[PDB]
Structure 1
Amino acid sequence: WTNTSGSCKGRCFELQEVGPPDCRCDNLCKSYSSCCHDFDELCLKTARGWECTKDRCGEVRNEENACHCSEDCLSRGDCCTNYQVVCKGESHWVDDDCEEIRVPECPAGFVRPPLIIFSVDGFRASYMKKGSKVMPNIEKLRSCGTHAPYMRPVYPTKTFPNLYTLATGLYPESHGIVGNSMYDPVFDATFHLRGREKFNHRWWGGQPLWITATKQGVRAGTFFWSVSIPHERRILTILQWLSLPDNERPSVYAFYSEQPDFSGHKYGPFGPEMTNPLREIDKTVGQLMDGLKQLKLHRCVNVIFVGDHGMEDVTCDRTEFLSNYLTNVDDITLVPGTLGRIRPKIPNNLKYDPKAIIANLTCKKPDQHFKPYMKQHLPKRLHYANNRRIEDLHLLVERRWHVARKPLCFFQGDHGFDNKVNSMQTVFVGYGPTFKYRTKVPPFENIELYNVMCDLLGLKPAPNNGTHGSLNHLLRTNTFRPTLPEEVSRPNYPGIMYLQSDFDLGCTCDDGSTEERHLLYGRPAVLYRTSYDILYHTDFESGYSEIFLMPLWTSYTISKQAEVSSIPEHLTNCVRPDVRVSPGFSQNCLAYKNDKQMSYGFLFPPYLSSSPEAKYDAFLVTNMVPMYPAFKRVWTYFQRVLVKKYASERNGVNVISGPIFDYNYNGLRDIEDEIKQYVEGSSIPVPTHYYSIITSCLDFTQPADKCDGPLSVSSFILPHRPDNDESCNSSEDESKWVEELMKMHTARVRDIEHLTGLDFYRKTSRSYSEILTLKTYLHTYE
């Protein structure tokens, strides 16, 4: 019980936490039914609006006014933000020339630059192109500070998952807010945007920035604002807190605006109607910046202007209905819209038939505007599977479309789609002493920001999914010095030890300076305890695992001019024992011969051997990996057509390929116990995915093998599946569908590192920070 009888006299938006029985005067109160009886009256004044007019200057203070223009307002910290411009002849901040801020210029008593996070909902990256004509304050922040052309949100590209990702540095599958709506089968409870259940702390994982700050003795303003509190009041409140005594004043602040999202939904992202809400947000940024200038803080504070996701054109007319595919949709619950998650309407309903459902949803219309996935099959770059609140059955929906359960307008915009979709990209600008001046940075992912916000506040981040140091290039100071992970397992370098006669595998073949040409960036370090051998070859090098019986990685270089050659018919089924590696640590062809479903492929492609002699090396048993015929369609096209195409296009490429095991879909390297499938009758483990990392010189005029400067990388994590049901056009020639599949499964090098326990690019001429940026890069193909 809370005693509402008390008063918010001299308590408005107090920062001190107040529990029952006493009543509150903070943001969470209206929201919690714990406000004092005079909260609305004392704390939410509106009288006379938000701006000083000439006729108010010098006024005697009336405590009923929303803000003040009286002579004492400044030391009281409650002037309207435009007070000085109107009453003291000062200029608006936006009208002042841009000037580099080389060090914080802070008033007496400020020990470090405060951080203000100004978050905007549904701010599409491309809105920035409207420029100073529509958004002059934001344009000044953008042009004079540090900006990315866009920032990538997490999937699903909706508000709750993204704002909490900004706050924690975690993927939704790890922080737990996997949607705006979710069902937790263990709680047997439902979380909704609307309603009180979301207030229960059990839903919220990881450690958000405000808790991290507080635990390290750094004070935070509110990161929650009640919907009933107008934006102008939010800004005045922040400015009031910044005027507090040294021993009360917070170091970190957040502002949130539900615009331009609301208007985007109503009018669509390209509507002329979007101009007004954008002007309104800019006006709010102006109030903040004018207010800061009034406090002599405009060259002291670091300001982050950041969005949660973008906005796409989505209308009533573009809705797929599940009732068109399934006979009884009244028996399922669908989280609908720009994504789909399906579960039985009755929890744990035994008649739920997910295999039959997926079958009826797979490639059933030519123009089908979604694709069903079991969550383990979703592209790994989405990191969207390892949480009990994520339904097994997912629908990835095509941009511009909705999926709904059945047919049983007022919106023209929506978002939630695959986070590499252009329309979903959002904004990032950093301005202040700690950010660089007039600097553009490449796009980056929102998971990276928590680390940077900790850097800006002198905090040590809780464990998270950012790669700390990968954004050092945004900062003038406060950068994080990363340290190389130490290698855990040193390799063996086995020389010859066996004779062909020593081998009984069922295999038949009916007929320096390797490290220099083929390992351009050093050997990958193995960051777990295991046993493996380096193997050298004219055309390739590998780290062969004696445990998993195949390479952990195979590395090779292909020159721009490289020749593509066939596999001679007499070598079609050629597999050769490797006299460097014991028969007991080798695969055997017998298992393949006997397994009616599983075939094999090679990591280094015989198609790219330098000579007919060299080709024989590609047929070694130590280059062989288990591949379903379905996967082989993809892999052969990749080995035979695409790698060469890349070399020709990029002036040579260096390729590192290998297996990934992630049977429990947690995005991390499986241990032996977690592997669940082997080649028939054998102990040869079956990868869930195969990766390839393709590196070249960013300066394409230089060959990959003689690159003096920054690198260019594209990588993939291809799902190893027994069919190509994912690819609706796979009945056609590989040239009509394989690249499309690969693009969907693009990946960061960092993603591969998590999944493999390997550490790449340890011997380069670049800084460690640059390499970390490279490893976080995602080639999106948009």
Structure 2
Amino acid sequence: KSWVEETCESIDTPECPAEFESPPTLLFSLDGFRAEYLHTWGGLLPVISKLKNCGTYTKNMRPMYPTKTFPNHYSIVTGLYPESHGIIDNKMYDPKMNASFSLKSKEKFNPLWYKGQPIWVTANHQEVKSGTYFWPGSDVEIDGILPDIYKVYNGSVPFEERILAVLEWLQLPSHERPHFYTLYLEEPDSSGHSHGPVSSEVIKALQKVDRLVGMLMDGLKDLGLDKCLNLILISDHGMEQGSCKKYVYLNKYLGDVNNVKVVYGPAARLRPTDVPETYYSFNYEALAKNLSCREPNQHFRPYLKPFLPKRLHFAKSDRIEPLTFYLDPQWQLALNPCGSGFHGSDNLFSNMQALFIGYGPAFKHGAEVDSFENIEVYNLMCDLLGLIPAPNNGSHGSLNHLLKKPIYNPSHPKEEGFLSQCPIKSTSNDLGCTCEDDDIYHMTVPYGRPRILLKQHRVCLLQQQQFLTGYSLDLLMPLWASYTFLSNDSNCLYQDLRIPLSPVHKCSYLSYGFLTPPRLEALLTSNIVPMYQSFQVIWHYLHDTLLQRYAHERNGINVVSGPVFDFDYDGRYDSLEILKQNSRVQEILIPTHFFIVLTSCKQLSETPLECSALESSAYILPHRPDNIESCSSWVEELLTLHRARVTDVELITGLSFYQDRQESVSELLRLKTHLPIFS
């Protein structure tokens, strides 16, 4: 009887033969296996279904931007964002190197491109043998390390052969055998492209893919290993249906010119031809203004690197062309001339979502877990091979719930900020505008106050009746303001006597804006933030029309909001150095973004002051001085786009939320790494 034919066996302890000190781990990849493919055609795919059922599965695995092969596989194996690991796209150009990058190129094997540290390098650096069978970067001198077995990419190698050869290396002697393996298949991505994501072709592709996984599983059976190998079935990204009738051509807006090179598809980027002579010279900003709001329903949108949604993490690398285009589902873009299956879109689109299944002794049997970014996988792979992971973008421990016996028991980040209290100091002035505690504190910060990770920043906690403000004495402005807005609730300001009187405090004196809205003290100087007029339309609608609407839906919401200063667009909090170097002229420090974390309970009957389980959403909102970005409906539509993980917020603000929460550290991490999927 074949492996597919049997019922679900439990694997409480690894049942390995002698010569196996521990389970070996296989990272099988099937290119462009849209997460959806399983949601529908599971009944046609018995093998993957059994893997789903006797294993740890997730309905959606969120890939990285851009949703292409090379950036995603290399993200999988480094736990890094493309912006940090180097491989930005299958086709890219580095102006510092003056070099191009093609898969069909000599540069394809150049070690300068691939940054970070893949799992096999990590395994090698720690005396663990590793055998790949095709994997982006595996045949490349990364840190001078190759895998202990590898294959240079020859795409025409039969699939059934790749399955056999991996099954052979498991037969290898205990001294030269790998402990970590990778497979790769081009399907269903080939058929995905050639015939589109919905076609009898992809069904065929899927059923081959299915049967070949069945083979490996039968081979592992016929090696005494079906209860010994830890399998991870995975994919890079999903697959979207192609257009012709939904393709943007920039010749219409520019004339059919040949002076700018423009990367095609949904991941569209633009740079000058005269490169690297005119790369940093080029005024991109004006070309963007020349291209925003140019149609009734403009299905594309220009975006200078830093002003893209930060949740994408696509700006730090110099390989990223300073002018990108965000696109709407299904739509692509070129410079000049379409009906093919494609990918590369927003990582939050439904069809970009990827497959993840974990089978074997380490993983749970028949557990559906929530959705996660693929950058988390690296840390899970380090755990499974007893490796200390390289520094990476995964929140290490957030996947502990996949594992029967998890290794890493994580703990919250320790507070590094300096937290002295603010008594009544600046007695006593006016601005001339035309005008017990523990019970109050607990109410403002029901989940615990944010913890200042900012080493070693001087912060004051300021108690008010309706809200708790976290004021920065190193920046003389608030960092955060938390209030609980329960389900049922104009040119004047007051001096806060606990904060130093900076001249920016009077009405006489880009404007001010309130962190906690007054329509519920909120007119304290310690509650105002520097804010543009074109942002005030977003802000005053958010707290009036939008936020009050949510309070009813959720039965109360708890809000934390504040400034974000990310001038160098990495998506982390800026050093005080570059804070000085970006304070425009009074010598105001001026926020690039405003964050807002909305916290409800999953149980609607509970109010935020009394949640069992948490419900979270967060927003990194961009503080642009005009609403060119967005041209009732438009303000919400901006919020949904500029969503962020709570972790994204923590990274960018140096704050840490929910440390005082019933939930374990691992549960909170999973909560804080949540993003919701569009369509």
TM-score higher than 0.5 here?
Answer: yes
| Counterpart residue number, 1:159 | 69
Alignment of 1:560-639 (within 5 A): 560-561=487-488, 563=489, 572-583=490-501, 586=502, 588-589=504-505, 593-594=508-509, 598-608=510-520, 617-639=521-543
How far 1:372 moved relative to its partner?
0.5
| Counterpart residue number, 1:541 | 468
* Distance change >3 Å, CA 587–CA 519, structure 1 → 2: farther
2:130 alignment partner, SS class: coil
Alignment of 1:57-456 (within 5 A): 91-224=1-134, 225=151, 226-327=154-255, 329-348=257-276, 350=278, 352-407=282-337, 411-456=339-384
Q: Distance in 2 between matches of 1:646 and 1:271?
A: 41
| Counterpart residue number, 2:144 | none
8 Å contact kept, 2:79–2:394: yes
| Counterpart residue number, 1:557 | 484
TM-score (norm 2): 0.94
| Counterpart residue number, 2:434 | 510
Q: Distance in 1 between matches of 2:43 and 2:517?
A: 56
CA-based RMSD = 1.5
How far 1:679 moved relative to its partner?
6.1
| Counterpart residue number, 1:80 | none
| Counterpart residue number, 1:736 | 633
8 Å contact kept, 2:80–2:394: yes
Q: Distance in 1 between matches of 2:237 and 2:244?
A: 21
Alignment of 1:38-49 (within 5 A): none
1:339 alignment partner, SS class: coil
Q: Distance in 2 between matches of 1:443 and 1:534?
A: 35
2:123 alignment partner, SS class: helix
8 Å contact kept, 1:154–1:162: yes
* Distance change >3 Å, CA 588–CA 679, structure 1 → 2: farther
The one-letter amino acid of 1:191's match is: F
How far 1:736 moved relative to its partner?
2.1
How far 1:492 moved relative to its partner?
1.9
The one-letter amino acid of 2:466's match is: D
Tell me the percent identity.
Answer: 47
How far 1:141 moved relative to its partner?
0.2
Q: Distance in 1 between matches of 2:503 and 2:182?
A: 58
Any stretches of 5+ residues in structure 2 without a counterpart? 135-150
2:493 alignment partner, SS class: coil
8 Å contact kept, 1:303–1:431: yes
* Distance change >3 Å, CA 587–CA 261, structure 1 → 2: farther
The one-letter amino acid of 2:617's match is: S
Residue deviations 1:151-196 (CA, integer Å, cap 9, x gap): 0000000000000000100000100001111101111110012122
How far 1:304 moved relative to its partner?
0.3
8 Å contact kept, 1:508–1:576: no
Q: Distance in 1 between matches of 2:191 and 2:676?
A: 31
The one-letter amino acid of 2:432's match is: T
8 Å contact kept, 1:746–1:780: no
1:284 alignment partner, SS class: helix
8 Å contact kept, 1:663–1:674: yes
How far 1:454 moved relative to its partner?
0.6
8 Å contact kept, 1:381–1:747: yes
1:213 alignment partner, SS class: helix
How far 1:555 moved relative to its partner?
0.6
Any stretches of 5+ residues in structure 1 without a counterpart? 1-90, 564-571, 609-616, 729-734
The one-letter amino acid of 1:581's match is: I
Q: Distance in 2 between matches of 1:328 and 1:576?
A: 59
8 Å contact kept, 1:549–1:684: no
TM-score (norm 1): 0.82
1:117 alignment partner, SS class: strand
2:567 alignment partner, SS class: coil
* Distance change >3 Å, CA 200–CA 677, structure 1 → 2: closer
Q: Distance in 2 between matches of 1:663 and 1:593?
A: 29
Count of matched residue positions in the alignment of Structure 1 and Structure 2 = 655
Structure 1 stretch displaced more, 219-228 or 398-407: 219-228
* Distance change >3 Å, CA 340–CA 102, structure 1 → 2: same
2:512 alignment partner, SS class: strand
8 Å contact kept, 1:124–1:310: yes
Residue 773 in structure 1 maps to residue 670 in structure 2: yes
1:262 alignment partner, SS class: helix
Q: Distance in 1 between matches of 2:187 and 2:368?
A: 25
8 Å contact kept, 2:228–2:361: yes
Residue deviations 1:680-702 (CA, integer Å, cap 9, x gap): 4x233111000000111111221
| Counterpart residue number, 1:691 | 595
| Counterpart residue number, 2:575 | 671
1:221 alignment partner, SS class: strand
1:395 alignment partner, SS class: strand
The one-letter amino acid of 2:203's match is: T
8 Å contact kept, 2:256–2:336: no
| Counterpart residue number, 2:392 | 464
8 Å contact kept, 1:323–1:406: yes
Q: Distance in 2 between matches of 1:771 and 1:223?
A: 36
How far 1:326 moved relative to its partner?
1.1
Structure with the larger RCO, 1 or 2 (CA within 8 Å, 6+ apart): 2
Residue deviations 1:244-292 (CA, integer Å, cap 9, x gap): 1111111111110111001011111112221110110011101100000
| Counterpart residue number, 1:746 | 643
8 Å contact kept, 1:587–1:621: no
How far 1:317 moved relative to its partner?
3.0
How far 1:349 moved relative to its partner?
5.1
Residue deviations 1:220-251 (CA, integer Å, cap 9, x gap): 01252431321111111111100111111111
Q: Distance in 2 between matches of 1:486 and 1:240?
A: 47
Q: Distance in 1 between matches of 2:231 and 2:517?
A: 51
Q: Distance in 2 between matches of 1:703 and 1:559?
A: 7
How far 1:365 moved relative to its partner?
1.0
Residue deviations 1:371-412 (CA, integer Å, cap 9, x gap): 0000100000001000110010001122212211113x6x43
* Distance change >3 Å, CA 157–CA 587, structure 1 → 2: farther
Q: Distance in 2 between matches of 1:131 and 1:328?
A: 44
2:600 alignment partner, SS class: strand
Residue deviations 1:532-559 (CA, integer Å, cap 9, x gap): 1110111100110112221111110011
8 Å contact kept, 2:98–2:276: no
* Distance change >3 Å, CA 493–CA 353, structure 1 → 2: closer
8 Å contact kept, 1:715–1:779: no
Q: Distance in 1 between matches of 2:74 and 2:392?
A: 12
How far 1:497 moved relative to its partner?
2.6
